[PDB]
Every structure is written in structure tokens, then in C-alpha cells.
Amino acid sequence: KGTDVFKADSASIAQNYTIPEWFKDAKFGIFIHWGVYSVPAYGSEWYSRWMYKEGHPINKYHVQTYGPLTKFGYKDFIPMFKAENFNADEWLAVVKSSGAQYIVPVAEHHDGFAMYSSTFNKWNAVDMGPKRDIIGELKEATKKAGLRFGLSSHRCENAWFYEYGMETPSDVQDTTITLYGERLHEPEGQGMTPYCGKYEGSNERSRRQFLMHTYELIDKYQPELIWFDWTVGKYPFQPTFYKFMAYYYNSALDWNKEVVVNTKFGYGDNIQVFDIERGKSDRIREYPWQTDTSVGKKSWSYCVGEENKSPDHIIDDFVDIVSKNGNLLLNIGPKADGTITDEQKNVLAEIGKWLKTNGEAIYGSRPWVIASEGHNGYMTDNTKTEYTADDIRFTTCDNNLYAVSLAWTDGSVTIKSLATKYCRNVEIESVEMLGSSEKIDYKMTDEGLVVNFPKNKPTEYAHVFKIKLKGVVVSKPLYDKVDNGCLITVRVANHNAEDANVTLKSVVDGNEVSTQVAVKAKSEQWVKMQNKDVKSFDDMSCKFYFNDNLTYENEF
Numbered sequence: 001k002g003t004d005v006f007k008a009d010s011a012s013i014a015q016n017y018t019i020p021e022w023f024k025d026a027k028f029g030i031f032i033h034w035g036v037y038s039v040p041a042y043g044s045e046w047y048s049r050w051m052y053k054e055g056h057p058i059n060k061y062h063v064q065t066y067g068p069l070t071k072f073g074y075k076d077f078i079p080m081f082k083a084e085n086f087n088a089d090e091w092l093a094v095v096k097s098s099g100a101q102y103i104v105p106v107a108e109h110h111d112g113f114a115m116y117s118s119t120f121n122k123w124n125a126v127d128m129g130p131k132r133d134i135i136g137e138l139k140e141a142t143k144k145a146g147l148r149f150g151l152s153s154h155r156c157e158n159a160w161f162y163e164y165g166m167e168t169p170s171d172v173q174d175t176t177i178t179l180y181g182e183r184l185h186e187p188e189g190q191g192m193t194p195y196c197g198k199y200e201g202s203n204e205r206s207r208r209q210f211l212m213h214t215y216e217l218i219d220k221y222q223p224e225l226i227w228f229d230w231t232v233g234k235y236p237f238q239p240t241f242y243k244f245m246a247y248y249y250n251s252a253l254d255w256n257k258e259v260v261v262n263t264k265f266g267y268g269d270n271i272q273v274f275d276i277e278r279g280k281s282d283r284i285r286e287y288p289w290q291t292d293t294s295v296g297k298k299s300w301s302y303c304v305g306e307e308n309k310s311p312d313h314i315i316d317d318f319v320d321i322v323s324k325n326g327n328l329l330l331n332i333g334p335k336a337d338g339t340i341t342d343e344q345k346n347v348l349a350e351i352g353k354w355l356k357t358n359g360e361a362i363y364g365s366r367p368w369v370i371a372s373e374g375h376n377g378y379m380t381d382n383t384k385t386e387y388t389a390d391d392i393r394f395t396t397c398d399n400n401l402y403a404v405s406l407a408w409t410d411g412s413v414t415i416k417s418l419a420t421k422y423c424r425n426v427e428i429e430s431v432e433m434l435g436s437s438e439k440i441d442y443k444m445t446d447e448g449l450v451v452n453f454p455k456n457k458p459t460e461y462a463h464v465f466k467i468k469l470k471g472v473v474v475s476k477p478l479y480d481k482v483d484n485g486c487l488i489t490v491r492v493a494n495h496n497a498e499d500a501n502v503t504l505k506s507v508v509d510g511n512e513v514s515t516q517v518a519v520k521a522k523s524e525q526w527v528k529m530q531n532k533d534v535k536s537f538d539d540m541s542c543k544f545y546f547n548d549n550l551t552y553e554n555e556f
């Protein structure tokens, strides 16, 4: 007791918190959406909300399949949630087989039902349904498997999730049933915004219970990561959430473990790990981030008739995410009895076999100077576009450069990011394809590093060239509009064994800014510059120089 480095405010957290290296090193986790919503097997965690909305397809489905809302409520699925085939060790063997490094079971979704040993919430999996501590058994299994344990909380939305049950006859109108939460209106605001309009989305009781909920998860299971759904960022909840963050980060100091909080918006990108959709951006993000997707094409939780995705598209996206400083949190949805389907076991096993061969380029890597090259919205056709071998993503680790082609070719590729205009004194020492015993034939040209693919595929899906090089490389510059000027961003990598001095020069509309940078041996860094007196960002004339060699000019 006594540890109080962190106070429940933003400036205190930012003063003392750093995103841990294990998260950056890990890259890949498995999300497991499993709960009472698995029983109807409709494929929606929002079953509990829409079943009470008169006329909604789920409402109509429920009334015919299970009965009127006054006789069969969401709570009445819970006795059926027996989980006769749940086995935590079996789950962890599937997770471990994927090559993932952490696991994120759902500790509590929006529906009010705790999947763990809760003291205040009598709607829990120890007392009801499975009659076991699902989260506790998964924590023990994860320790034995040698992975890191996280979990997700979606309880904040329980404050309003059952609001439609008050508008039509149903058991939600019996306000003594606490599973159904505060029955408030959903907060206003579209998408990821802290604005809530005239409905706060929480109240005093739900805020206090959120602290009881997160405190007991922290105290009982000491998770290394806690993921939260989107409404914890609405303005009225932020004081409560900062109290949670301080308690979690202070506890973690005592545990001698560094921890991660995920949120979708509302909090600084340095005091937590953003969990965000993948943009259209090719850019490397400065801070580590996470993005989530399901193995199922249709759903996250289990539904009959699910069509699962192919390992190829998942792996291609995974590599793209990793090249841009992201982690992939990939979801499986077990059946209500606790069985992970053969199809999803197979997808995870294929990813794991890919990582067995190619993981050197993934685990522990960091973004290079630039994440991607190659050709890769509103199309009024089905174009059937796929990646080609010329679509390349980059990572670096231990001064090695990994160039990952997202498809195969019988010919060659030319790595354009190693074109001579980006390079000073670059010499290639070796090139190999991970998993290949064949010697790679390659040649440096002015246009880049030409690399001939070997004869046999070591793996499907994506193919890694490991490149050992010396020299200094700069990325192509990025331009961002600032008032009366422009911000220029590059990354520089010194692959030499000795420190290097580099000069960058941005000449925009005749205004010249220069910076000299000492880049430590076998290291890389962001460099930002700013040109002034730019009348028009769209009409600007731009030249960028790397040690007085022209790297870029907006020629077209």
C-alpha cells in the first residue's frame, strides 16, 4: 500500500507513464468475444439491446424463437449458458498456436454479465451460467502457456444498453433486475467524440460501479492490459476513468509489471495505447497503437453459418499494421458451449505457421524509415484487386531491414525505397528470404535494390527478405499544412556501425531551412522541419535534399 505516483489527472499520468516495450515487441494478440450473446448464436453482442426494440429484426427473431419480452428476457439465456466444453488450457493452446503473444478475453461486455468472480455484480459467471471463474481460469492457463494476460471491459455502455426495454412491455421495466443497468438514453454524438449532447451516457451509480468493476479486475487478476469500449471517453465519464487509470498504473508499479490501457478516443496518445480503425494512411504512427478485427467475415461472437476470412488477407493486413507501428488484436468467437470452431482453429494455426518461419521480421521489430511502397475507394465495379509482390512493407530489428512482399512473383521486385536518391553510402552486405535455403540474387541500381525471388515458396501469403546493409537512408518527405508554412517530416536510419552526421534541407517557395542531425550508429529517428512564408500550401514549390542530393521535388 501507499504507492501514489499517479494522480487521477492527465498531466500526472503523462509525467510518469511510458508505453511498455513488451507491447511494442509483442505485435499480435487474440481477442475472444464469448458470453451470454453466444447462446442465441445470432452473431451479435448487441442482441441484448435490439431484442427490446419493437420491430427490430432481432426483436422479431426473439419473440418467435424464445417468447415475449415479458416472459423470456435476455437474463433467461443465462441458465442455458452452461459452457460444458469450456477448457481454459484448450483455449490457450489455440491462442499459442497462432503465434500471438497476449490474450484478451471479454471480462464483461455491454450486457451486464460479469465473466469473472465479481463481488458487487451478482450477475456473474461464477454464480450463474458456466458456474466458474472464466477469467480466473484463463489467467492461470495463460501463465502456464507463457503468454501475457489482458482483458476487455465494455461495462460503461451498460448504463444505457437496455434503454429500449423501457419503451415496450418487457422485463427491463422491472427495475429490480440489476443486469439491465441504469436504462439511460444512449449518449449523443456520432463516432469517436467525447461530446454527449443532453444524455450523459452514465450516472453516479454506474460510475461508482465502474470503479468497483475495474478495481476488482485489477486486484484479483492483475491483467497486463485492459481494453475499454468507446463510451469511457465521453466527457462526463472522464473523471471516473482517470481515477481508474491512476489506480491501475499505481498497482502496476507495485507488481513490477508494465501495463497497457486501450481506449478508442478521448485520451492522449502517450498516456494510453489508442485502439483505432486502420486509416487509409500509409504513414507510420509515432506512438504504438492497436487495431482489431474478427476472423469471421460476418460476426465477432459465434453465429451459425459464419464464413471465416482467409489467412492470406489477415496476414497481409497484419504485416501492414506492424510496419506502421501497430499491433493486431484478432478476434475468435467460440460457440456457446465453449468450443472454438475447427475453422477458426485452422486460421489461427496457419498464421502461427507463417510466424514460425517469418516471425523474426515481426516480433520485437520497429517501423523503418518508411512503412510501404507499391500500388496496393469509390469503384463502380468489383475490381478483384489483390496485392502483388511489388507491394512491400518494411520493418527493422537489430539493424536488419525486413522487406515483406505481400504476394509472390516468379520474377523480381525493385525496392524503390532503396533508390540512390534516398541513400548515402548504402552497401548491401547480404539478402536472404526467411525460410529459404536458396541464395538470393540481387543488384543495387539507381532505381533501387533489385531482388530476384527464389524458386520455391517457403510459405504462402507473404514473403520476407532479410537485408543486411550499411549506409544512411532517408524516407520520402511528408508535408503537412501549418499556418503560413508547412511541416516537413522524414525518418533517417543510420545502418552504419558508426555515428553519422546528416544534413536535411527543405526549400519551399525559395525559403530554405536546414538541419544537421547526429544519427547514432545502428539507429533511426524522426526529423521535423518547418518552412515559413508559404502563401498557398496547394501551390507551393518544394525541393528536399539529403546531404545536398535532391530526394524529392513536387515535379507533377
Ligand SMILES: [Ca+2]
Pocket: 312, 313, 316, 387, 406, 407, 461, 462
Ligand atoms: Ca498475400
